[PDB]
Design a protein around this nucleic acid. Structure first.
Lengths: 18, 49, 49, 320
RNA sequence: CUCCGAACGGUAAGAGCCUAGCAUGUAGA
RNA sequence: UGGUUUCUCUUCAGAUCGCAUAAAUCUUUCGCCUUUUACUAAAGAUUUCCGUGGAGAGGAACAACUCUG
């Protein structure tokens, strides 16, 4: 089940890699 | 979460494959019934008229 | 009176009229920037030589 | 005893004012210009000829088709008198130079009718091969193949109010195919005969429908059977409706039965005559449409005579 | 007087043997 | 009041938008014609391409030199 989000790709890729 | 980033292809290229011979959809349908009118015989003289 | 200069002046004046007699449109257009889309791609690159 | 019986609608009878006969063959389509000046009408002689809408005299003669011209849809949003021929060619004869400008193709057989959408820049060409075609105007290309008919799609309707495109199939099943998707959103549980007629009354109600045998009304949102038709068992081919409440039914037998869109009773129900050169049983209303001024009705018969029926004031026509 | 043409409508038809300039860039344990 | 430039993107262009001018398509015409495409040019209108014009949006270079008023 797909569920998109309207969050920023910059802050999401920075927080997960940290 | 997976980011959907569309890869920008080269805008000068031959197509990557031939004509697609795959089935796109299903040959069954939703066969909705008629329900218009009850079909019956007209008369005994309908074969002569 | 050259014999070559007479038909050469007649034919050069022929395409002078024919490119202005019927070939006078208002010249409308809607699209632009053909090669500019290739410069904004991820594969081409501009330089000077 | 009947509901709404002692209060019908008002409908004075009409009268033929001029019978123009200039074509050579059975006229299959007739349309009026939105400026109430031109009257485009095809024929079996492969020549769509325009005439004066009020004077009745001839105005132009435009040929080019290779078969019978069974469709003439004059566009009101753009100067282009598009025509549908039976030679598998939707010849969009633009009136800006009185010649073919588009010559769109794509149908596998004859085209039954063509209808121009008032809002979307596309032409609904109801073909007769296996389906209709959504041809894009000024693009010379089809948009989508609305294949939702088990037979030839005779009638066509492109309303701005109805989101779908009402297609009249000859397989006794009307359909409403959507413009974006293409599939039939709702069928019709009526019209047991081969439905080859459709109408629309956007004056004070929704768009109706029609059928040769056992016709009935309908609604624009998803369909709603309001009431059936009167005793008209002939093969109906023309169904026009005016904004004043008149409902004209043109059949192939020549019995031009005129009824009311609200009351339903036949007001005139008169039968027209025929040409002296024609046969005894040949007069039949193949196409009928009211004028742009809604004053003089125009019905193109099958006896090679475009008849015009004007109005007449009377009061001794009370229906029981 | 100085105006200059190109392709298709064309070489067949077959038997046994012989040698070549080419292409893909995988999941798996 | 306050900015000379330059590059990206959003409309309408009825101004020789082009002080010059290509190709294709459609509807009619001529010449050859022997199957066809490549053909010859007269009329009209439909695209594509070579280009351009005002007016808002985002970057770079002294934007500060102080331009008109």
């Amino acid at each position: 089940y797909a569920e998109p989000a309207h969050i920023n790709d910059f802050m999401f890729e920075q927080q997960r890699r940290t | 979460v997976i980011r959907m980033v569309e890869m920008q292809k080269d805008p000068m290229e031959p197509p990557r494959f031939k004509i697609n011979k795959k089935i796109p959809r299903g040959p069954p349908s939703p066969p909705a019934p008629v329900m218009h009118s009850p079909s019956r015989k007209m008369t005994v003289k309908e074969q002569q008229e | 009176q050259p014999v070559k200069v007479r038909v050469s002046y007649q034919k050069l004046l022929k395409y002078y009229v024919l490119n202005a007699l019927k070939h006078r449109p208002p010249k409308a257009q809607k699209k632009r920037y053909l090669f500019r889309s290739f410069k904004a791609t991820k594969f081409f690159q501009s330089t000077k030589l | 005893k009947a509901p709404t019986m002692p209060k019908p609608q008002w409908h004075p009878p009409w009268k033929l004012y001029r019978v123009i006969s200039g074509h050579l063959g059975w006229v299959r389509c007739i349309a009026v210009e939105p400026g109430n000046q031109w009257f485009v009408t095809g024929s079996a002689d492969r020549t769509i000829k325009i005439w004066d809408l009020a004077s009745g005299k001839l105005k132009l003669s435009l040929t080019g088709h290779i078969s019978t011209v069974r469709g003439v849809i004059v566009s009101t949003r753009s100067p282009y008198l598009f025509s549908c021929g039976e030679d598998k060619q939707v010849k969009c004869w633009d009136l800006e130079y009185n010649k073919v400008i588009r010559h769109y193709h794509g149908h596998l057989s004859a085209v039954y009718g063509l209808d121009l959408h008032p809002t979307i820049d596309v032409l609904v060409t109801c073909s007769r091969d296996s389906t209709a075609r959504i041809w894009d105007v000024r693009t010379k290309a089809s948009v989508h193949t609305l294949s939702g008919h088990t037979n030839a799609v005779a009638t066509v309707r492109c309303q701005a109010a109805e989101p779908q495109i009402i297609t009249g199939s000859h397989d006794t099943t009307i359909r409403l195919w959507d413009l974006v998707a293409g599939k039939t959103r709702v069928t019709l549980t009526n019209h047991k005969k081969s439905v080859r007629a459709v109408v629309l009354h956007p004056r004070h109600y929704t768009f109706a429908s029609g059928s040769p045998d056992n016709i009935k009304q309908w609604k624009f949102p998803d369909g709603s059977f309001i009431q059936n038709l009167s005793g008209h068992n002939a093969i109906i081919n023309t169904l026009t409706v005016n904004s004043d409440g008149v409902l004209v039914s043109g059949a192939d037998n020549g019995t031009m039965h005129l009824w009311d869109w609200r009351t339903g009773y036949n007001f005139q129900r008169v039968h027209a005559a025929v040409q002296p050169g024609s046969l005894d049983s040949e007069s039949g209303i193949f196409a009928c449409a009211f004028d742009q001024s809604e004053s003089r009705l125009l019905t193109a018969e099958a006896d090679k005579t475009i008849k015009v029926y004007r109005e007449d004031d009377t009061a001794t026509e009370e229906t029981h």
